[PDB]
mmCIF file with all atom_site columns, C-alpha atoms in Angstrom:
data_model
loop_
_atom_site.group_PDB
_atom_site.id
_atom_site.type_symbol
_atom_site.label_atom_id
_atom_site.label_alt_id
_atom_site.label_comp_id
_atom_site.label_asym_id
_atom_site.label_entity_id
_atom_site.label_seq_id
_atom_site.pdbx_PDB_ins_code
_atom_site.Cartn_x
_atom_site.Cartn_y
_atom_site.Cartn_z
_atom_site.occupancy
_atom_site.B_iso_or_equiv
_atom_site.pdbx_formal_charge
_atom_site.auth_seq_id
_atom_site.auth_comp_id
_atom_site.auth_asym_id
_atom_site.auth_atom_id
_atom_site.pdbx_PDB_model_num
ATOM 1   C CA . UNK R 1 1   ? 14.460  -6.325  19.970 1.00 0.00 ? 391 UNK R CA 1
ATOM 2   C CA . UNK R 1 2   ? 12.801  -2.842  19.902 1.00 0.00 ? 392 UNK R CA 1
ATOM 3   C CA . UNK R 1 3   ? 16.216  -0.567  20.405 1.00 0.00 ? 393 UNK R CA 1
ATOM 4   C CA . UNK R 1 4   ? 19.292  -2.421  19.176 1.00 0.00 ? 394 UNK R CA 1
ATOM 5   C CA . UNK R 1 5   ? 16.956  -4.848  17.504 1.00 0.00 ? 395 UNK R CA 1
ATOM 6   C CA . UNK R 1 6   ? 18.718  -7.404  14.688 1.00 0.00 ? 396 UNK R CA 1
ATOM 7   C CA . UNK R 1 7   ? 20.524  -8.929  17.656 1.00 0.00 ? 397 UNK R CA 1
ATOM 8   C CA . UNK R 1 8   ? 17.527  -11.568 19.101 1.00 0.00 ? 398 UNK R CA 1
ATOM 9   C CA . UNK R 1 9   ? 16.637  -12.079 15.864 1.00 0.00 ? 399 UNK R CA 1
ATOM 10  C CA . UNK R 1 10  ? 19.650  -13.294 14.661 1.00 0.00 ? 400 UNK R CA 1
ATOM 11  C CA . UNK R 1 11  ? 22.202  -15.599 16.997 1.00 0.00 ? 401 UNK R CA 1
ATOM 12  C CA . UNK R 1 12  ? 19.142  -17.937 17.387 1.00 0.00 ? 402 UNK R CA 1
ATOM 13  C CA . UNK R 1 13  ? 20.049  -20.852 15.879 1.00 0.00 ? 403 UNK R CA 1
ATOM 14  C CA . UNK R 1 14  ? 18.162  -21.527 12.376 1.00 0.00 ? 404 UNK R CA 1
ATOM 15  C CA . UNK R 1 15  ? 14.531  -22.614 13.546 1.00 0.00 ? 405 UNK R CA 1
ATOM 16  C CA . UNK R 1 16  ? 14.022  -20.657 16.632 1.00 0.00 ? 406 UNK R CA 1
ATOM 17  C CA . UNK R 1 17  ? 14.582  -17.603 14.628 1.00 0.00 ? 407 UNK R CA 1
ATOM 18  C CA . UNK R 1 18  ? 10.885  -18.198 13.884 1.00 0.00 ? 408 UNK R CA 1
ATOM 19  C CA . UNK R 1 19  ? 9.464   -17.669 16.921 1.00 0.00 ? 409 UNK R CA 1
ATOM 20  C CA . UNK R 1 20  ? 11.702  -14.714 18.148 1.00 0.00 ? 410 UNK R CA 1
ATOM 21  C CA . UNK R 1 21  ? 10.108  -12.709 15.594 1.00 0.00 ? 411 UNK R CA 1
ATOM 22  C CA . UNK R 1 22  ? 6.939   -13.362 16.724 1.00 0.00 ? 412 UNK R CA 1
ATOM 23  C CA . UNK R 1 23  ? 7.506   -12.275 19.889 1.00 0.00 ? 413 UNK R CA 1
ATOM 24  C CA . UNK R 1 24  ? 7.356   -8.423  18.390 1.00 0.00 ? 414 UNK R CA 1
ATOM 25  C CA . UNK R 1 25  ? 4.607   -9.177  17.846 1.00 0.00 ? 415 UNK R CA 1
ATOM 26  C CA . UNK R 1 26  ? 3.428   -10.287 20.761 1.00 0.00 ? 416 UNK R CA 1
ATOM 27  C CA . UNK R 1 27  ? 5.269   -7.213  22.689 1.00 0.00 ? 417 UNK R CA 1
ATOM 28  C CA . UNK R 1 28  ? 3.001   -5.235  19.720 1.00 0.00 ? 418 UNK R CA 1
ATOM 29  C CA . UNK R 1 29  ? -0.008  -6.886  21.043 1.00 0.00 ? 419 UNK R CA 1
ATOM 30  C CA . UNK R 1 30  ? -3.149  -4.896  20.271 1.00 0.00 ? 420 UNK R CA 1
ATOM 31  C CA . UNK R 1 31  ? -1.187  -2.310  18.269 1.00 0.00 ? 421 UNK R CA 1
ATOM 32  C CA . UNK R 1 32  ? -1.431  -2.705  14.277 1.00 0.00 ? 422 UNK R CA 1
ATOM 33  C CA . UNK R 1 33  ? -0.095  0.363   13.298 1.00 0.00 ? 423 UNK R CA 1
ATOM 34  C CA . UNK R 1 34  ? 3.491   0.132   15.252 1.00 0.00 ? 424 UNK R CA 1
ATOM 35  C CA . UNK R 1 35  ? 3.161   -3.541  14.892 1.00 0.00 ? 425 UNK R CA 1
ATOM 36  C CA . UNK R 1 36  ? 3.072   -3.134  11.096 1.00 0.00 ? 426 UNK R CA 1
ATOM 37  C CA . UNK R 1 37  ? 6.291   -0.472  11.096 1.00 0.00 ? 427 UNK R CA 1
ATOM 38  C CA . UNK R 1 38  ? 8.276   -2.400  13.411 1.00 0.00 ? 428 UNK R CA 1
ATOM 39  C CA . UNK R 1 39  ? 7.671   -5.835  11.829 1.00 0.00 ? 429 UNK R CA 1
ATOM 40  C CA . UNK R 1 40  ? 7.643   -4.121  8.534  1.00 0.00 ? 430 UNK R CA 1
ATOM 41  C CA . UNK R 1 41  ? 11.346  -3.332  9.431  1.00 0.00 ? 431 UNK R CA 1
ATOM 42  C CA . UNK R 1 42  ? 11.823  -7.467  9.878  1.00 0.00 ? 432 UNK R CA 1
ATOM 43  C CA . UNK R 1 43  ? 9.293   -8.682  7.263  1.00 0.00 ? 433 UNK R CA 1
ATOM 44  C CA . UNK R 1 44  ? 11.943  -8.715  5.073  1.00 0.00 ? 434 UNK R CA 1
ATOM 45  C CA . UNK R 1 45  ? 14.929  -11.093 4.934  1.00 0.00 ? 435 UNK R CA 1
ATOM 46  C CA . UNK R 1 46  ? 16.644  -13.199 3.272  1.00 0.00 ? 436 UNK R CA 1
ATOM 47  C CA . UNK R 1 47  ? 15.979  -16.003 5.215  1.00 0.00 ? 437 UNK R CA 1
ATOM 48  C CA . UNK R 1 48  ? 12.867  -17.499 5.443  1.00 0.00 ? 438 UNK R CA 1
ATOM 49  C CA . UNK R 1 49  ? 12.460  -18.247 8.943  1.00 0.00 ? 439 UNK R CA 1
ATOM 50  C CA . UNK R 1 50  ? 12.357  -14.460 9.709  1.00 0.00 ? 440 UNK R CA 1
ATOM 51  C CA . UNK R 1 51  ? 9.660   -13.734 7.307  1.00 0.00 ? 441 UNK R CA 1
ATOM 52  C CA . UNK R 1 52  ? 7.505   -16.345 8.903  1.00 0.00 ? 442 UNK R CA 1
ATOM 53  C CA . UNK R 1 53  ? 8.408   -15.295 12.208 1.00 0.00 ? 443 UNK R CA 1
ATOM 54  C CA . UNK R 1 54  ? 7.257   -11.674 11.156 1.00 0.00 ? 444 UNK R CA 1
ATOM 55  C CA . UNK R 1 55  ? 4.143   -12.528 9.470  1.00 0.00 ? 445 UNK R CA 1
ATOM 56  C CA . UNK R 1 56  ? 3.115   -14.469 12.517 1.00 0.00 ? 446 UNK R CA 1
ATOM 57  C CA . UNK R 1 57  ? 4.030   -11.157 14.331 1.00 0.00 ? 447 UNK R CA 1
ATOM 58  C CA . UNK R 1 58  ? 1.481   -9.566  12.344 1.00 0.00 ? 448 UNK R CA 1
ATOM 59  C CA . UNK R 1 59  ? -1.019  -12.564 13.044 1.00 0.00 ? 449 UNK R CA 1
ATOM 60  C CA . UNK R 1 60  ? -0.737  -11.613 17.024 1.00 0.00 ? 450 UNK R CA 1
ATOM 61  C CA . UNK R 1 61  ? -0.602  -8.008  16.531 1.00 0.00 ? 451 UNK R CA 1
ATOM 62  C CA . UNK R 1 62  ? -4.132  -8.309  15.015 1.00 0.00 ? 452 UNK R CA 1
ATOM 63  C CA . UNK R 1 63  ? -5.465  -10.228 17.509 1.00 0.00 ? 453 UNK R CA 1
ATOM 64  C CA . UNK R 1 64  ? -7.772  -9.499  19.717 1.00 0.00 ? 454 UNK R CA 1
ATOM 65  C CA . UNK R 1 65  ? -8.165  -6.207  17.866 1.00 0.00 ? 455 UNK R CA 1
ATOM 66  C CA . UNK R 1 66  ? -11.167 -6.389  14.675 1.00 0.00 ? 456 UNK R CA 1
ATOM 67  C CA . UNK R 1 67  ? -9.594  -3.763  12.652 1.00 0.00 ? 457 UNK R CA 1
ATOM 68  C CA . UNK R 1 68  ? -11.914 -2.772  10.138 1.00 0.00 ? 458 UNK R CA 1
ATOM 69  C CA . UNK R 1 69  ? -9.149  -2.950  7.361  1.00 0.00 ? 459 UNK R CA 1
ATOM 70  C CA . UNK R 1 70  ? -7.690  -6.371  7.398  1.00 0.00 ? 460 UNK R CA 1
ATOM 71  C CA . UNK R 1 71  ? -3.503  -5.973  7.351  1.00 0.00 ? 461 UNK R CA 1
ATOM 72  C CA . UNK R 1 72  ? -3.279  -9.688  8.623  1.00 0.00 ? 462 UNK R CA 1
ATOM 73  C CA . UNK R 1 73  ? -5.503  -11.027 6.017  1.00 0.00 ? 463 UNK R CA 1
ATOM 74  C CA . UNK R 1 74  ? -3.296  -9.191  3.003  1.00 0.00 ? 464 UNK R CA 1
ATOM 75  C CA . UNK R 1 75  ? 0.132   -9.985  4.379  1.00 0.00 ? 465 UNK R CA 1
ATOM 76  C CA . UNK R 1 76  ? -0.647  -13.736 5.459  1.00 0.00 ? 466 UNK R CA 1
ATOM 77  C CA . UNK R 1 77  ? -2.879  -14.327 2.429  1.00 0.00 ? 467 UNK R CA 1
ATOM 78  C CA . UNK R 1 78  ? 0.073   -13.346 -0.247 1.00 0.00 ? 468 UNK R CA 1
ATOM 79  C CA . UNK R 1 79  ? 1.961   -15.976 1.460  1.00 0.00 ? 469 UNK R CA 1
ATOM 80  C CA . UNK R 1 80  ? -0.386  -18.788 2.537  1.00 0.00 ? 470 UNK R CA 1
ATOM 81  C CA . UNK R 1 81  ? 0.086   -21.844 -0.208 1.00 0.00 ? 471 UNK R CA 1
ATOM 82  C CA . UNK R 1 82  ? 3.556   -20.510 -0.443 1.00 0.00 ? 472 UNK R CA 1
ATOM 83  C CA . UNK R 1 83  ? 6.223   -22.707 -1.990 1.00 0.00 ? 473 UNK R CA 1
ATOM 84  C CA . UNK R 1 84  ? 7.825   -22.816 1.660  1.00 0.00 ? 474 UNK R CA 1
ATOM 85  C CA . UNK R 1 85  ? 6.433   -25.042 4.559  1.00 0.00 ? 475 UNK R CA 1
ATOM 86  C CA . UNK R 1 86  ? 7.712   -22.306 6.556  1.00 0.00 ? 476 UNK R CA 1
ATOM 87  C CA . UNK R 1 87  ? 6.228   -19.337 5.518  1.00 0.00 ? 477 UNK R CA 1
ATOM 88  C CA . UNK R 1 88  ? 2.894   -20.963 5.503  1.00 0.00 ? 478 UNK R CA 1
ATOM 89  C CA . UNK R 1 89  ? 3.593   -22.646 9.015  1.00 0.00 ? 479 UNK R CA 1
ATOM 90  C CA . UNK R 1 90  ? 3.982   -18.602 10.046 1.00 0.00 ? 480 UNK R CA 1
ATOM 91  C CA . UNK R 1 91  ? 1.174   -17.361 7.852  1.00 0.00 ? 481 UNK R CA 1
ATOM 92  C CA . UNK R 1 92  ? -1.180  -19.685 8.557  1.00 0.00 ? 482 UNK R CA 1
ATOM 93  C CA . UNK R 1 93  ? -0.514  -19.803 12.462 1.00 0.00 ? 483 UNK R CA 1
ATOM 94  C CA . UNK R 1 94  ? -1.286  -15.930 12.065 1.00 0.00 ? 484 UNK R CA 1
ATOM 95  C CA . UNK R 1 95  ? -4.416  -15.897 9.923  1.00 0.00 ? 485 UNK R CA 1
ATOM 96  C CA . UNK R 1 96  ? -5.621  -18.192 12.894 1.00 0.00 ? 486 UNK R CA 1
ATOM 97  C CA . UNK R 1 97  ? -4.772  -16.532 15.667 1.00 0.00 ? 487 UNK R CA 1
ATOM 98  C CA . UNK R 1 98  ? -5.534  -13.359 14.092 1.00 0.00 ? 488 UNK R CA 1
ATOM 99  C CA . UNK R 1 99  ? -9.221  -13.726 13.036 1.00 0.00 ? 489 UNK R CA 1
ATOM 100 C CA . UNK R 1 100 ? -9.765  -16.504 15.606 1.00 0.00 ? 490 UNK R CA 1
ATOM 101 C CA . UNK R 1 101 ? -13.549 -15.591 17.023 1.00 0.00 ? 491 UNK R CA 1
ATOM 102 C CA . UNK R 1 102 ? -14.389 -14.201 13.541 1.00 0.00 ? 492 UNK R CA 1
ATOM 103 C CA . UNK R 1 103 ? -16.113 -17.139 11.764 1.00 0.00 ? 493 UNK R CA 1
ATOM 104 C CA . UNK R 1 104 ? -15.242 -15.114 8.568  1.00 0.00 ? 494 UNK R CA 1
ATOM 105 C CA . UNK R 1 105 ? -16.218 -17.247 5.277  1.00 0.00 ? 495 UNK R CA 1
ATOM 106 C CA . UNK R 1 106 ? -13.491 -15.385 3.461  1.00 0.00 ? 496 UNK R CA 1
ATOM 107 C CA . UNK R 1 107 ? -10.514 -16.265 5.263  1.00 0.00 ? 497 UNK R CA 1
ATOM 108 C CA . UNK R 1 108 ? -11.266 -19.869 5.497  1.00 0.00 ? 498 UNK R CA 1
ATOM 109 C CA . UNK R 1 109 ? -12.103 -19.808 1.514  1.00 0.00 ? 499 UNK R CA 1
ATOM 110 C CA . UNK R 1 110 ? -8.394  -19.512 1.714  1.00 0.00 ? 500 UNK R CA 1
ATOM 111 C CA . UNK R 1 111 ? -6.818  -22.080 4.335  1.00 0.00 ? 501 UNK R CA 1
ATOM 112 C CA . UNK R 1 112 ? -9.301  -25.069 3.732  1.00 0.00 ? 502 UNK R CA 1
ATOM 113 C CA . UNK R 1 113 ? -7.501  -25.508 0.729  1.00 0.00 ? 503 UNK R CA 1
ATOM 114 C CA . UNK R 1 114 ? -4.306  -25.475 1.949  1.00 0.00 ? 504 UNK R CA 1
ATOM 115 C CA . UNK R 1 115 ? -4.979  -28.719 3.664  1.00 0.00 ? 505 UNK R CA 1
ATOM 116 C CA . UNK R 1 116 ? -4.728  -30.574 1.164  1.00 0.00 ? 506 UNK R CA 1
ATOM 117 C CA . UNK R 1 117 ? -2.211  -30.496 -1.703 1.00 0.00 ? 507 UNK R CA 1
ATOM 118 C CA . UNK R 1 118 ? 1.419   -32.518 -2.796 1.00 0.00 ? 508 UNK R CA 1
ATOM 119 C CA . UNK R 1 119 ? 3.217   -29.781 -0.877 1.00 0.00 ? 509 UNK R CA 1
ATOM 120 C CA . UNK R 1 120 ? 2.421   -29.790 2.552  1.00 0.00 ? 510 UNK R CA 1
ATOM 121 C CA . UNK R 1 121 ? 3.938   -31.556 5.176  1.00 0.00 ? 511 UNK R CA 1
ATOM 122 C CA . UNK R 1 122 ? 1.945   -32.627 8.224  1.00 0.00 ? 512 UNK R CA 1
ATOM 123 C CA . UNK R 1 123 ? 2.884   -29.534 10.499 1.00 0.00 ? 513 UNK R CA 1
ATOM 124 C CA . UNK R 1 124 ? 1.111   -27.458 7.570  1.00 0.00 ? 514 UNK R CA 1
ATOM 125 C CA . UNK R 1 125 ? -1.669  -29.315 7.817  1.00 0.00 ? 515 UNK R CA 1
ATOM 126 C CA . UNK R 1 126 ? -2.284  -29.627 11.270 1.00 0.00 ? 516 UNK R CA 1
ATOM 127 C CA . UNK R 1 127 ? -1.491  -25.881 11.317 1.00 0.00 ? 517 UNK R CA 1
ATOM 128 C CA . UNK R 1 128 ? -3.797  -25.725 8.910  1.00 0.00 ? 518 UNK R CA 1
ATOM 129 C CA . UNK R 1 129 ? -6.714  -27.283 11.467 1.00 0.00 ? 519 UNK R CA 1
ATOM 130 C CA . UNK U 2 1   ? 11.449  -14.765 -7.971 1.00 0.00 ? 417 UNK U CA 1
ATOM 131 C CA . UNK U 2 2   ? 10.952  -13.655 -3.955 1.00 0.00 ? 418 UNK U CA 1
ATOM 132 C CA . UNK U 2 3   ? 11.791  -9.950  -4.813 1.00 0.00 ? 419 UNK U CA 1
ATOM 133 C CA . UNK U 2 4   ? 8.663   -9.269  -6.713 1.00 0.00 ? 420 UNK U CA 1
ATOM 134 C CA . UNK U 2 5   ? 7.009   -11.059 -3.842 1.00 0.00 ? 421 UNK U CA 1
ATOM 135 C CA . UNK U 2 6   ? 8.700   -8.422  -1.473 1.00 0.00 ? 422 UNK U CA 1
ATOM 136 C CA . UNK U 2 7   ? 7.510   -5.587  -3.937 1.00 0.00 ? 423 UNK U CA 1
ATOM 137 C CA . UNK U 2 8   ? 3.928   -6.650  -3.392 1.00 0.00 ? 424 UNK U CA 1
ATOM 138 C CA . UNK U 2 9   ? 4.162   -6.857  0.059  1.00 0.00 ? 425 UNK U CA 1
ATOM 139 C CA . UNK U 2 10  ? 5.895   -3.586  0.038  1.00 0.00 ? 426 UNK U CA 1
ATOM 140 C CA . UNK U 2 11  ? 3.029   -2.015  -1.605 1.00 0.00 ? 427 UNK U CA 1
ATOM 141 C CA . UNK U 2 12  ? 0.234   -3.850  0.465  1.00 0.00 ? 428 UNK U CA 1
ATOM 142 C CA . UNK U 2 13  ? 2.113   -2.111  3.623  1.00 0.00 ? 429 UNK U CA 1
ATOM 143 C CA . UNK U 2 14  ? 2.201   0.965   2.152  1.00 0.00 ? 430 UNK U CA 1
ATOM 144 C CA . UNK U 2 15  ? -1.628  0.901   1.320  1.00 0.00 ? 431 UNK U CA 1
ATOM 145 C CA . UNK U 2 16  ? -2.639  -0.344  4.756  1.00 0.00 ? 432 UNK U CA 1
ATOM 146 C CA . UNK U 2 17  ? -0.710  2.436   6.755  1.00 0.00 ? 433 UNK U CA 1
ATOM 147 C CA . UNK U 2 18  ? -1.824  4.961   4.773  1.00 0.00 ? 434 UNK U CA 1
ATOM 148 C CA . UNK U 2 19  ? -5.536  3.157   4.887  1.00 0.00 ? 435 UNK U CA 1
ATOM 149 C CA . UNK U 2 20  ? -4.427  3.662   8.771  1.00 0.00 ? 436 UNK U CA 1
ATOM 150 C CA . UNK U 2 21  ? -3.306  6.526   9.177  1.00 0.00 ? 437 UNK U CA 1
ATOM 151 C CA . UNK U 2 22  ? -6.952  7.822   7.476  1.00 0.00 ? 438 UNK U CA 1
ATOM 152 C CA . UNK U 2 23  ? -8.815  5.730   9.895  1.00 0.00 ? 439 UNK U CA 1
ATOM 153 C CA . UNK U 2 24  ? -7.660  7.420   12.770 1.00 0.00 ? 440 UNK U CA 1
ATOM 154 C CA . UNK U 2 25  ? -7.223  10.751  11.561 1.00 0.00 ? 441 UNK U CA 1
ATOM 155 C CA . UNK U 2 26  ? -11.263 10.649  11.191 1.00 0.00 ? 442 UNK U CA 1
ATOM 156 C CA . UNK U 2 27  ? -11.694 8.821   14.406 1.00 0.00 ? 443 UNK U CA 1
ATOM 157 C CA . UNK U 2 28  ? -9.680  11.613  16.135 1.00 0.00 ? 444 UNK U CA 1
ATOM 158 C CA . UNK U 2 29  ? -11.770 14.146  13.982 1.00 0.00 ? 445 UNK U CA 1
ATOM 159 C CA . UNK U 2 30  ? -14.382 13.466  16.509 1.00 0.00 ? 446 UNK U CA 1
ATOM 160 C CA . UNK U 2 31  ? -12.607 12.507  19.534 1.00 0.00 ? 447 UNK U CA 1
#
């Protein structure tokens, strides 16, 4: 991916496109500022499953790391209740992983209601949990 | 539709690397 890059990103198949995204971000583990240019680079497509891949990128970039800006809660928060199951089910996934031992009120004043609405399948919602 | 949606985006990234790229300039101004 880093190099080349576009290559295991794309050839995957539809839905597994998701997750090869993510793992930038999980080779970008502990590293916000290259994680943001690199995923940056992917964090927009026109497909959906690579801007859910990416935003779950940014998810694991921030974890682990309590940076005192919060890039994973602006970039997952614009797209959390998205009109997508997909970019939620990458959003979401992120927020979770990202802020994970944080017990922050803010960021679950914005997934608890995600829960429950008309539009959102039971992988968003158990995501969601 | 999804373009002004990238635009935002766009503009959140460019706020947090630049809110970046100040927090470790003064965390290397001691270091």
């Amino acid at each position: 991916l880093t190099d080349d890059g576009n290559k295991w990103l794309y050839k995957n198949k539809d839905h597994g496109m998701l997750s090869a995204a993510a793992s930038l971000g999980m080779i970008l583990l502990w590293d916000v500022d290259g994680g943001l240019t690199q995923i940056d680079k992917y964090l927009y497509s026109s497909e959906d499953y690579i801007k859910s891949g990416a935003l779950l990128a940014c998810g694991i970039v921030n974890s682990g790391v309590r940076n005192e800006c919060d890039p994973a809660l602006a970039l997952l928060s614009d797209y959390v209740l998205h009109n997508s199951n997909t970019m939620r089910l990458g959003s979401i996934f992120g927020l979770g992983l990202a802020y994970a031992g944080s017990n922050r009120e803010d960021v679950l004043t914005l997934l608890l209601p995600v829960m429950g609405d008309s539009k959102s399948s039971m992988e968003v919602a158990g995501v969601t949990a | 539709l999804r373009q002004t949606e990238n635009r935002a985006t766009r503009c959140k990234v460019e706020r947090l690397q630049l809110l970046l790229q100040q927090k470790r300039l003064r965390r290397k101004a001691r270091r």
